[PDB]
Design a protein around this ligand. Structure first.
Ligand SMILES: [Ca+2]
Ligand SMILES: [Cl-]
Ligand SMILES: [Cl-]
Length: 653
């Protein structure tokens, strides 16, 4: 939360302007239901047309500026138009100008950036007028997406733009910037590949970027980038504009737009898709945001006593269920798809968004390209939004095609996320085997006690690390006192192997491949770059671990049996085998999903000693992965194993 004490008044309006209907009344949602596609400003040299939805305002003006920090040069009254909107046509070339709206609501005058801003001045305090077709890179017309047959074929790599390149030995020129991720042939310590070439070399398929929309000045001051700065960016200010600090010049409204497009273009050309982390559940400050200045009381949620609903713990919630805000969110997502060619969205605190909005998002995206991903945090959380309407795990039956982070699997694999010392499956805790099995099955209702929230495996995102909470390495350290470094590395590798061999959608945190550490920091949202950078020196010292992750990713690609699209397939082909404590064993039988081999066998071994394991009588097993752990494969077949790690066997066709 960056929301501050507000030294001012919120006036919710002169109700005579809206026929005696208050912005808080239920009947208000039935009025002023503007359906047009032209909210915002449409620039052309001949003229610019403005449209603002502000039904409770008695007056509205367009305020024109020649510079991002100048004095107004014109203040033009708008015409009250249809369905609560205001319109203006300026019959001059407005190129290079900036603007705000000024409204009178009740007795208050307030000035605000356009909620539909597609470009802004530094720190997002004024809307910038320009033709966004001038920001398209060369060949943008021919941008082509890497193929994607199923959500279960994605391998997501979660990355922050500043983390990627800001380490001083990253070998990347535009450190901390969108353009840093376009640079090819970059080299780190000992000449290792870094940056984009490191990521493509891993074999991941999607880069999921932490907030790249424009977030608040409290997070990062775009005018002070010559001083230390860092923030994850979960404090939204301008939803439809990129963040200024990731551009080479935040004072050039076009730079951040062109450079983000160059990033997306380069990733697509190198075989990667891009997922945007989006935060439609709250804004940086409910009192200061343009929504509240322009239509106070409408776009954010209020309790019955007229205080903010604060279910996000960030000070406010967006009222996604009200028609014009649902419209705003959908049109925002469509802008990122159409203008920037984005390939997926990760919804922060998706349980704060209503089901109707999420399903309409999915429906509109499916009309364009069904391979666009939609995943989110479907946590169960209190809010004034009624429980049955929250887009969370409890309601996953109502959210077809939307993936949710599988926290039950996360905790079963690596131990409790909040009680740091507690072991899980990998680290020798007792009784976590069934939790791992539930995740192996993609979170579906597999059978018996093996069930979670997913109807279909495309609804379950598997992970053991993300930007939140301790890294997997740091969590292992806190929960394994007395264990050696080598023992902890084996546990870490086992956790990654579980993610990449489970049904569902595998999700990796950037740097998990070299056992990323934050030195024990649990919540690094504003920690300095020394805590948050991708440590390319550590990467250079962990090339064996990086190759191990690469080989797991390659194993999953080679075997469609790990990527079954439906729950019926999983229930027909996945079989859990009897297995001793601190192990999990399963088979994927009968060419599951088109697998080239007749059968697969997978053992997750968290037992450090020697075991003789029974193998199912399915044919001549052969080792395909983890041979270092296999002392013998006896052809009444048995597997002689030792040590912590994954083993995969197959019966050839
Ligand atoms: Ca910003
Ligand atoms: Cl910067
Ligand atoms: Cl709930």
């Amino acid at each position: 939360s960056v929301q501050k004490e507000f030294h001012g008044t919120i006036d919710y309006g002169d109700v005579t302007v809206t026929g005696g209907i208050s912005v808080f009344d239920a009947k208000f949602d039935e009025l002023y239901v503007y359906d047009g596609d032209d909210l915002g400003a449409v620039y052309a040299p001949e003229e610019t047309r403005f449209r603002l939805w502000a039904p409770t305002a008695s007056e509205a003006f367009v305020v024109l500026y020649e510079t991002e920090d100048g004095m107004p040069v014109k203040e033009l009254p708008m015409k009250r138009d249809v369905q609560g909107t205001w319109t203006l046509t300026v019959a001059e070339d407005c190129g290079g100008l900036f603007y705000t709206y000024r409204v009178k609501v009740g007795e208050q005058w307030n000035e605000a950036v356009d909620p539909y801003a597609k470009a802004v001045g530094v720190n997002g305090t004024k809307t910038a007028i320009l033709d966004l077709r001038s920001t398209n890179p060369e060949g943008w017309e021919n941008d082509q997406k890497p193929p994607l047959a199923s959500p279960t074929d994605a391998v997501i790599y979660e990355l922050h733009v500043r983390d990627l390149s800001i380490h001083p030995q990253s070998g990347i020129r535009e450190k901390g910037k969108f353009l840093g991720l376009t640079e090819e042939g970059t080299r780190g310590p000992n000449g290792i590949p870094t940056g984009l070439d490191h990521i493509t070399g891993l074999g991941v398929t999607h880069v999921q970027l932490l907030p790249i929309y424009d977030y608040s000045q409290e997070s990062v001051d775009e005018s002070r980038l010559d001083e230390p700065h860092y923030n994850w960016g979960y404090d939204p200010q301008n939803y439809n504009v990129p963040e200024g600090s990731y551009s080479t010049d935040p004072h050039n409204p076009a730079a951040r737009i062109l450079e983000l497009k160059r990033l997306i273009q380069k990733l697509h050309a190198r075989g990667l898709r891009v997922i945007m982390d989006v935060v439609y559940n709250h804004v940086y400050d409910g009192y200061l945001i343009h929504f509240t200045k322009l239509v106070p009381g409408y776009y954010l949620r209020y309790k019955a006593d007229r205080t903010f609903s604060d279910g996000t713990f960030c000070g406010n919630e967006c009222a996604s269920e009200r028609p014009i805000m649902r419209k705003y969110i959908i049109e925002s997502i469509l802008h990122w798809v159409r203008e920037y060619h984005i390939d997926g969205f990760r919804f922060d605190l998706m349980g704060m968004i209503d089901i109707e909005t999420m399903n309409e998002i999915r429906r509109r995206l499916d009309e364009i390209d069904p391979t666009i991903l939609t995943i989110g945090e479907g946590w169960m959380m209190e809010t004034v939004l009624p429980k049955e309407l929250r887009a969370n795990q409890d309601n996953a039956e109502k959210l077809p095609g939307i993936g949710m982070f599988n926290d039950g699997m996360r905790d079963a694999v690596k131990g409790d996320i909040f009680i740091f010392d507690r072991k899980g499956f990998i680290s020798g805790g007792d009784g976590f085997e069934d939790g791992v099995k539930r995740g192996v099955a993609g979170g579906i209702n597999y059978g018996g006690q093996l069930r979670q929230f997913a109807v279909e495996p495309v609804q379950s995102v598997n992970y053991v690390e993300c930007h939140d909470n301790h890294t997997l390495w740091d969590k292992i350290e806190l929960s394994t006192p007395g264990a050696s470094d080598e023992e902890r590395r084996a546990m870490h590798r086992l956790a990654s192997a579980i993610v990449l061999t489970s049904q569902g959608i595998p999700f990796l945190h950037a740097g998990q491949e070299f056992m990323r550490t934050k030195g024990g920091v649990e919540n690094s949202y504003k920690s300095p770059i020394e805590v948050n950078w991708l440590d390319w020196e550590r990467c250079a010292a962990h090339q064996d671990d990086v190759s191990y992750m690469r080989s797991l990713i390659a194993l999953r690609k080679a075997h469609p049996a790990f990527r079954l699209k439906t729950a019926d397939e999983i229930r027909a082909h996945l079989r859990f085998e009897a297995a001793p404590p601190h192990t999990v064993a399963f088979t994927l039988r009968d060419h599951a999903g088109g697998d080239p081999d007749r059968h697969l066998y997978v053992l997750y071994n968290a037992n450090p000693g020697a075991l003789s394991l029974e193998l199912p009588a399915l044919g001549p097993w052969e080792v395909r992965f983890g041979g270092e752990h296999v002392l013998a494969l006896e052809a009444g077949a048995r597997l002689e194993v030792r040590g912590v790690g994954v083993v995969v066997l197959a019966v050839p066709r």
